[PDB]
């Protein structure tokens, strides 16, 4: 478990239907919302690949060994019942294990992709801002809507505001 | 000055199947499903006994083709397709159970 979905992000954004991992900003212009394409597409592709590998099954042909309209010998019938009930229990246990493990892995994979996008945005905002902890980024100088898109487009340059941030933090 | 980090790779990668990706490229990998065997019966270290044209029933009843195998000791009994059990024509009641009992045994 990573500290993103069940950790420092103590609240989800139900109003963010644009994607699974998006940005919400508040600048002098006002409040705005967008979504990151890369992480959302990665999660969607992984989940769809899981589902695709899951739903495919050739299911080798089987035939009837027990008669439905006549009586079977008692001993061989008991043997068949025992075998089929054992197979049922085995498949039930494997189904439980597969479902539980796959759900855990899907949730933790969404969490990992969230944290990876977080680290990407941090590597972009390397030396011009600070992270308050609750998923937000306390920008120390400013950021325009075009600056926000540059953060989305992964084109934000920190050497352009480095000296500005240093002078604002010192004075 | 500058120092970078990275991993290695190969030109001809190996494709493996995962939970999220059906075709994932990795380095030199290993096959887990065997597809080739040896067309021989490796009996070194095993006191084998080849019945040849002798059938397990002929060892108990004493057919001519089993005169070489009326008695003996072995840890592995080998039966052949041309195994003759009857010189005089006939059949055996519950022949499968007796054949299993004989092939499971290690001496007569």
């Amino acid at each position, epitope marked *: 478990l990573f500290g993103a979905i069940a950790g420092f992000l103590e609240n989800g954004w139900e109003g963010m239907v644009d994607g699974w991992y998006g940005f919400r900003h508040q600048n002098a212009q006002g409040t705005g919302q967008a979504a990151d394409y890369k992480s959302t597409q990665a999660a969607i592709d992984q989940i769809t*690949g899981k589902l695709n590998r899951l739903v495919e099954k050739t299911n080798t042909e089987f035939e009837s060994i027990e008669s439905e309209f006549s009586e079977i010998e008692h001993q061989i019938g008991n043997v068949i019942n025992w075998t089929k009930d054992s197979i049922t229990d085995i498949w039930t246990y494997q189904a439980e294990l597969l479902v539980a493990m796959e759900n855990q892995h899907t949730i933790d994979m969404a969490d990992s992709e969230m944290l990876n996008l977080y680290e990407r945005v941090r590597k972009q905002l390397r030396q011009n801002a600070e992270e308050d902890g609750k998923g937000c980024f306390e920008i120390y100088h400013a950021c325009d809507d075009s600056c926000m898109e540059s953060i989305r487009n992964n084109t934000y340059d920190h050497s352009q505001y480095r000296e500005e941030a240093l002078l604002n933090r010192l004075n | 000055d500058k120092i970078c980090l990275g991993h290695h790779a190969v030109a001809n990668g190996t*494709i493996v199947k995962t939970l999220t990706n059906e075709q994932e490229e990795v380095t030199n990998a290993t096959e887990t499903v065997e597809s080739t065997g040896i067309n021989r019966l490796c009996m070194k270290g095993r006191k084998h006994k080849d019945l040849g044209n002798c059938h397990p029933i002929g060892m108990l009843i004493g057919t001519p083709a089993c005169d070489l195998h009326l008695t003996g000791m072995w840890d592995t009994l080998i039966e052949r397709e041309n195994a003759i059990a009857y010189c005089y024509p006939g059949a055996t009641v519950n022949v499968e159970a007796l054949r299993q009992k004989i092939m499971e045994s290690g001496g007569i």
Partner: antibody
Amino acid sequence: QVQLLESGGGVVQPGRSLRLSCAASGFTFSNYGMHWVRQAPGKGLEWVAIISFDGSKKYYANSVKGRSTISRDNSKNTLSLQMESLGPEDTALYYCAKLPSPYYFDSRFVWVAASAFHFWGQGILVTVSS
Amino acid sequence: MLTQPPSASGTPGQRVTISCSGSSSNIGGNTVHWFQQLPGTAPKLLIYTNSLRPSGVPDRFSGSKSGTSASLAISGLQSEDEADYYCAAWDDSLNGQVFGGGTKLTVLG
């Protein structure tokens, strides 16, 4: 399930405008982002236009950018395309279809699915000449 | 604009492969797609997300993606699979889907 209707075909002279319109049924059209593609006679595939499920952005192809216009209406479940100045490079078969596209061009209801709703129906075969 | 290897050849049950290369603007980084056009009829979707298949595709077909190059493989091909096969992918700079040239394959008769 897979049943459609297409209109706008015929013989249009060069210089005038072509207007094509396809309407599908058997599913919820108001969610799938649709695509218009063209194929010149013979072989060769060239994409024309894409549209969001609500019509937010078009992002036309550079070959016909600023010259064509794609539009959609989710009430009547229809997708239309209008193009002007039809040179000989526009005589082709125009397919309206649902292709695997970016996720926000589709709706959140079909993200969690491995169905991969497939299409491409029939053709149109627009021709421009005397 | 993607690469256009025009033709591939093989025999029934030979596992022929068709390649589709490009740049980071189209391949990436991004997902590619594959389609099958039977001679005289409409295309049918075969591969999406570079390894996934829709309902009506037998498991004999398979797709891949190696870095900036993709490939298409057909294991159990027979006489009823001689058709046209094209490549497709979404372009990053060009905000749309850019395709390949195409491939016309024919079995060794």
